[PDB]
C-alpha cells in the first residue's frame, strides 16, 4: 500500500551528539480514527526490532528520554538528544492505518570515525588451491571509512562481472571502521591462462581508486 | 518484561512447508493479537500477518496471501505460521510480535513485543562439509612492516561455523566475515592482520568447528 | 445445554435466569411508558404503534450489532474503525428509516389517524437512526471494555433500543401533540 | 456480505429487503392492538406494558427456539420426538410463566395499578406458555414443512409471539375489566 | 428405483482404519438422513450409525460409539464411514442405508433403500497361493454304485476362489462350500457326487482360479 | 436396548402355503409419538436387506401383497398369503423408537422337502496331502434335510473337538437339500500314529447316529 521511505539509508555520527531521522510516508498516514500511526522501531544490531516510538508523538516504556518524536501529516522525525552507545542498530519506522503496514526502509546509526583509507592486498589461490581442483582469488578491503565501497573486478586488468561475492562486516567495536571481502570464484583453467589480477576499490577519501594486482 | 519466544533455526527445501511456532508468555495470549513480521536477508521487514487469538482468524498482507497461514491455539498459547510454496525469495528471518489488544486498551496499535528470530532457509540442504582454504600472502611475502593473513571456507552449510585464529589465542586484527550464500553452499571468509617480524615467525594456524558435519578442520598458512 | 436429558426444573433454572434479566429491562420501558401516560390519556392511538416501533427498533439493533459483530470477527473491521463506519451507519439508518416510516404511515393512514402520521413518521426515522447507530456502536464499545460483541449484544442491542425507542417516540409524540 | 466494501445504497438494499417483512408483521401488531381500543380507552394503564409483555414473549421465543434448534441439529431430538418435548415445554413454560409473573405483578404493584394486578399476572403467565409452546414447536413445523429451521426461526418465532402478546393481553384484558 | 452404491470389496489388517464410502445416487443427498448397519458372517444386523447429511452430524449406537466415525460431503453425495481401530470382531458387511427424511415426509422412519455391502475382513493382509489337495475316496473305490469325490483347497486368502470341475463341465451333483476363515486364512473345499461306474472310468480333474495370486492349479483325483 | 428377538429361527414352509414369522419384542415399542416402529425387511440370498414392512400395519411401495404385517404392543407378525419363490430368504423384524434401533435376529425362508438322511463320506488325506506340508482329513455330508445337522469328530472312536471347521452350504435350488462339509486340521504324526476316523452325524431322521470311519 503505502509504499513507505527513509532518508538517509546511512547516518554518521558520532557519540554524545543529536542524530536526526526524517520518515516520509507515501500518502498520508492520518486514520479515519483520525491519530498519526507511525510506530518506530529500533532494532540493535543481531537482536529483533524492538518498539521505540508510537503514534510518533508519544514514547514506549522502558525507553530513554534520548529519543524524540515529532512531526506530523506526512513527514514524520526521530531525533536523538545525546546519541549513547546502547542506542546504536537500525531504526525502522513503520505504520499501520492502512493495511498492510509496511515499515520503512530503515536506516543505520554508524560512529562518525575518522575517515580512513583500506588496506587493500589481493590474495591469489592457495597452494591447496594449486592442488584443489578449484580456483577461488580473495581480495581483502580492510580498515576503511565510510561503508560506502565499491570493488572493481579487473582481470589482467580487463574487467570482469561474473560470479563475484562480497561481504561487509558490520562496525568494528575498537575503531569502528569497517572491512570488506572481495572473493572471485572460477574454474581451474580460467586461473591457469590468466596472469594479473587487478583487485580495484574505489573510496571516496582516495583521488584516485585504489588497485591491487599480482602477476603468477 | 513479557518474553516473546519463538520457535529455532529452520532448514527447508524449496517447494515445502514449513510450521514456525511462536509461543506467548507473560500476557494473556487469548486478547492480544500476534502480528508475523518478515526480515529479508539484512534488509528492510515486510508485515505478513496478523493472527486475532481469540477469534481464530487473521488478516493478511497483500503480497503474502496463500504464501502463508497464521493458525493459533488458545490452550497451548501458541501462534503457528505455516508458510506454503516457499521460493527461495522466502530466505529470511520470520518475527512474531505481540502487537494489537483485543480491548485495544493499549493506545498504540502495532508491534509491543518481538520474537527472537526463526531463520528460515530455502536450498537443497546437501550438509557439505567445509572445505577450508588457507588463504597465503600475495608472493613471497613483500616488506611493508603490516602485513596481513587470511582464510577462506568455501563449500559447507548451514550458516554457523566458528573460525578462530591459532584456536581462539590471537583473536587481534582478525576479521570475520558474513556466511554470504552462493548457489546453495555458502562461504565463510576470514583475516588476520599482523606485523611482518611475527609471521611467518609465528606459527598462525587456521581452524573451523562446523556443527552439522562435525568437523573441525587445521592448517597453518604456508608462505608461497 | 444437553436437551432431551434435561427435567423441567432444569431447564427453567437457565431460562429463567435468562428471562428474568430481560424482565427487568421490561420493567424499565414499562416505568418509561407510565411516565409518558400524559400523552397516551390525550390520545390512545399511540399506544397502537409501540409493538411496531419497538420491534423496529431492536431489530435495526439485532441487524446491524450482527452485521458489525460478523464482520469484526473475521478482521474486516478493525476495532479502530468506529469513526469510519459511523458515517456509513449513520448513512444507512438515513436510508432505512426514510422507507421504514414510508410504509409505516401508510400503514397509519390506512388506520385513520392523520393526527398520528406526523409523530409517527418522525419516530420511526428517529427510532430506526438511534437503534442502528447504537446497534453499530454496542460491537465496539463492547469489544473495547473487553467483552466478545457476540455474546452480550444480541439482548443488549434489543434492550438499549427499546428503551430508546420509547423515549423517543413519546418524546416526539410530546413535542408534536401536546 | 462483506462489510467495510459495500456501499450505504447496498447495506440500505439488503436490511430494508428484511426489514420490510418484519415490519409487515409489526403493522399486523399494531393493527391488533387498534382492535381492541376499547379497552385501552377505558385504562391508559393497559399500554403501560405492551413493550414488556412482548418482549417477554418474544425472547421466550427466540429462546425455547434456539435450545430446540441445537437439540435438533446435534441428533439429540428428532421430528418424531415433538410429543416428548411437548409435555415438557409445557411444563417449563408454566414453571416459567409463574416466575416471570410473580415479577411483574410486583412492578405492577410498585407502579400502583392495582386494577391492573390480575390481568397482568394472568397475561404474562397465558403468554410465556403460548409463546413458549409456540417457539418450541416451532422448529418440528418448520423442519416438518421442509425448511431449516436455523434459517427461519429466529424472526418467526419473535412475529407469532408477538402476535399473540397482543391477541392474548388484550383478550384477558376485556375477560377481567370489561 | 433409487439405486444406492457404495465402495467395493475391503481388506485390512488389525488396528487399521478404513474409510467406507457410500455414494447416493436418484434422490437429494441433502435431504435424508444415511444409517450405517452392519451385517456380520452370516447373523442378524446390527445398526451403527445414523448420519444427518445436512447438519453433517451423526447419533451412534452404543456399542460402536468411537469405534465407528460418520461424516459426508454434501457436494460429493458421498456417505463415509471411518471405522477405528477395527479388531477381528468388524470382520463383517457393512451396509448404508437412506432410512430418514429431513422434512420427515416419509411416513416410516427407517430403511428405505440399502447399499450392496462392502465385505470388511480384519485378517492378516498374507495372500497366499490356494494349494489344492484331490480328496481321493475312502479306500479302493468301495462299492455301493454311488460313490462321490471331493477336492480341498485350504490356505489361501481372500474370500473369491472358483471351482469348477472338469473347467465347468460336469457340474452335476457338485457342492461347493463357503470360504470359512481358519487363523488368518481360508479354507474352500468342493463335492461331486458320481456314479461308480463313471469314475475312475472318466478323468475328474479339480481346478480353482484366486486373482490375487493369478493362480490356476489343476489337478485330478487318483484312486487310492 | 430393546434386546429384540424372533421365533422361530428357521421357517420350514412349502411353495405356496401360509408362513406366520413372530416377532416378539423385549419392551413395548410405542414411541412417545405413539405408532409402532416395527419395520420388517426381507434380504434375499447375497443381498441387501430391503424395506418389506415398515410400521407393522403399513406395507412399502413395490412389495406384493402375499405379505400380511399385522400385530401391535409388543408382539408382532408377518405372515405370508402364498409362499412364492421370489419370498424366499431371511426376514429381519427391526425397531426404530429406541436408540439404538436394533434388529432382529432374522429367520429364514426354506423349503419343506421331504426329510432325507446323508450320504456321509469320510476323505482320508490326499495322497498328495501324505507329502504336503499340512495333515487334514475331511468328511462330507451330502444332501440331507433339515438343516438340523452335527457331527461328532471321534479319533480311533474317541471324540476329538480341537481345530474344527464346519460350512454348511444353502437351501440347494434342485431339490431343497443340504449338505455340509467337516474338515479336521492336524499335525502330522497325529495323522500317522492313529489309523481309525470315526465321522459321526447325528441326524433328525435317522434313529442311530450315521457313521463313517476308515483305518489306514
Redesign the interface.
Same mark, same amino acid.
Given at each position: 500500500?503505502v509504499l513507505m521511505t527513509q532518508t538517509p539509508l546511512s547516518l554518521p555520527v558520532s557519540l554524545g551528539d543529536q542524530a536526526s531521522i526524517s520518515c516520509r510516508s507515501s500518502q498520508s498516514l492520518v486514520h479515519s480514527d483520525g491519530n498519526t500511526?507511525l510506530?518506530w522501531?529500533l532494532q540493535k544490531p543481531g537482536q529483533?526490532?524492538?518498539?521505540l516510538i508510537?503514534?510518533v508523538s508519544?514514547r514506549?516504556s522502558?525507553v530513554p528520554d534520548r529519543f524524540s518524536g515529532s512531526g506530523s501529516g506526512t513527514d514524520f522525525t526521530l531525533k536523538i538528544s545525546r546519541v549513547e552507545a546502547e542506542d546504536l542498530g537500525v531504526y525502522?519506522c513503520?505504520q499501520?492505518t492502512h493495511?498492510?503496514?509496511?515499515?520503512?526502509?530503515?536506516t543505520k546509526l554508524e560512529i562518525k570515525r575518522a575517515d580512513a583509507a583500506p588496506?587493500v592486498?589481493?590474495?591469489?589461490? =592457495?597452494?591447496?588451491?594449486l592442488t =584443489?581442483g578449484?580456483a577461488?582469488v580473495?581480495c581483502?578491503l580492510?580498515?576503511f571509512y565510510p561503508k560506502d565501497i565499491n570493488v572493481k573486478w579487473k582481470i589482467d586488468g580487463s574487467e570482469r562481472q561474473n560470479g563475484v561475492?562480497? =561481504?561487509?562486516?558490520d562496525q568494528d567495536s575498537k575503531d569502528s571502521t569497517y =572491512?570488506m571481502?572481495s572473493?572471485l570464484?572460477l574454474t581451474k583453467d580460467e586461473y591457469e591462462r590468466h596472469n594479473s589480477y587487478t583487485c580495484e576499490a574505489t573510496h571516496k577519501t582516495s583521488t584516485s581508486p585504489i588497485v591491487?594486482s599480482?602477476n603468477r | $518484561?513479557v518474553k516473546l519466544q519463538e520457535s529455532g533455526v529452520e532448514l527447508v527445501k524449496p517447494g515445502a512447508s514449513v510450521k514456525i511456532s511462536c509461543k506467548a508468555s507473560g500476557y494473556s495470549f487469548t486478547?492480544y493479537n500476534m502480528?508475523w #513480521?518478515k526480515?529479508s536477508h539484512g534488509? !528492510?521487514? $515486510?508485515?505478513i500477518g496478523?493472527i486475532?487469538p481469540?477469534?481464530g482468524? !487473521?488478516?493478511y498482507?497483500?503480497?503474502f496471501k496463500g504464501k502463508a497461514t497464521l493458525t493459533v491455539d488458545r490452550s497451548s498459547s501458541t501462534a503457528y505460521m505455516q508458510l506454503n510454496s516457499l521460493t527461495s525469495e522466502d530466505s529470511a528471518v520470520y518475527?512474531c510480535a505481540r502487537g494489537e489488544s483485543? !480491548?485495544?486498551?493499549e493506545?498504540?496499535?502495532?508491534?509491543?513485543?518481538?520474537?527472537?528470530?526463526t531463520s528460515v532457509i530455502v536450498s537443497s540442504a546437501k550438509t557439505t562439509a567445509p572445505?577450508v582454504?588457507?588463504?597465503?600472502? #600475495?608472493?613471497g611475502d613483500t616488506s611493508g612492516s !603490516?602485513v596481513?593473513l587470511?582464510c577462506?571456507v568455501?563449500g559447507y552449510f548451514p550458516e554457523p561455523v566458528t573460525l578462530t585464529w591459532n584456536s581462539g589465542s590471537l583473536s587481534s586484527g582478525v576479521?570475520?566475515?558474513?556466511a #554470504?550464500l552462493?548457489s546453495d553452499l555458502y562461504?565463510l571468509?576470514s583475516?588476520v592482520?599482523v606485523t611482518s617480524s611475527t609471521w611467518p615467525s609465528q606459527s598462525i594456524t587456521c581452524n573451523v568447528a562446523h556443527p552439522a558435519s562435525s568437523t573441525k578442520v587445521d592448517?597453518k598458512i604456508?608462505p608461497? | 445445554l444437553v436437551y432431551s436429558e434435561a427435567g423441567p426444573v432444569a431447564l427453567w433454572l437457565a431460562r429463567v435466569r435468562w428471562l428474568v434479566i430481560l424482565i427487568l429491562t421490561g420493567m424499565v420501558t414499562s416505568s418509561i411508558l407510565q411516565g409518558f401516560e400524559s400523552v397516551l390519556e390525550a390520545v390512545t392511538a399511540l399506544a397502537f404503534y409501540v409493538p411496531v416501533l419497538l420491534g423496529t427498533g431492536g431489530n435495526t439493533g439485532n441487524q446491524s450489532a450482527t452485521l458489525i459483530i460478523r464482520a469484526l470477527?473475521? +478482521?474486516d473491521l478493525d476495532?479502530?474503525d468506529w469513526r469510519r463506519v459511523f458515517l456509513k451507519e449513520m448513512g444507512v439508518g438515513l436510508l432505512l428509516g426514510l422507507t421504514l416510516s414510508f410504509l409505516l404511515v401508510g400503514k397509519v393512514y390506512w388506520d385513520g389517524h392523520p393526527l398520528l402520521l406526523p409523530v409517527v413518521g418522525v419516530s420511526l426515522v428517529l427510532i430506526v437512526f438511534f437503534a442502528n447507530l447504537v446497534g453499530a456502536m454496542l460491537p465496539f464499545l463492547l469489544? +473495547?471494555?473487553?467483552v466478545?460483541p457476540a455474546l452480550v449484544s444480541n439482548p443488549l442491542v434489543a434492550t438499549l433500543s427499546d428503551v430508546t425507542g420509547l423515549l423517543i417516540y413519546l418524546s416526539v409524540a410530546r413535542l408534536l401533540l401536546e
Open positions: 500500500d500511526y510506530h522501531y529483533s526490532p524492538k518498539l508510537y503514534k508519544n514506549f522502558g525502522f513503520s499501520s493495511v498492510p503496514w509496511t515499515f520503512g526502509g530503515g588496506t592486498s589481493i590474495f591469489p589461490p =592457495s597452494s591447496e588451491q =584443489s578449484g577461488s580473495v581483502f580492510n580498515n561475492l562480497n =561481504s561487509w562486516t =572491512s571481502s572473493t570464484t591491487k599480482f | $518484561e486478547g502480528n #513480521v526480515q534488509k !528492510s521487514l $515486510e508485515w496478523n486475532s481469540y477469534y482468524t !487473521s488478516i498482507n497483500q503480497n518475527y483485543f !480491548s485495544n486498551y493506545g498504540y496499535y502495532a508491534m509491543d513485543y518481538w520474537g527472537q528470530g572445505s582454504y588457507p588463504l597465503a600472502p #600475495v608472493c !603490516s596481513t587470511g577462506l568455501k576479521h570475520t566475515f558474513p #554470504v552462493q562461504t571468509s583475516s592482520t592448517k604456508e608461497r | 470477527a473475521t +478482521r476495532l479502530r469489544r +473495547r471494555l473487553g466478545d
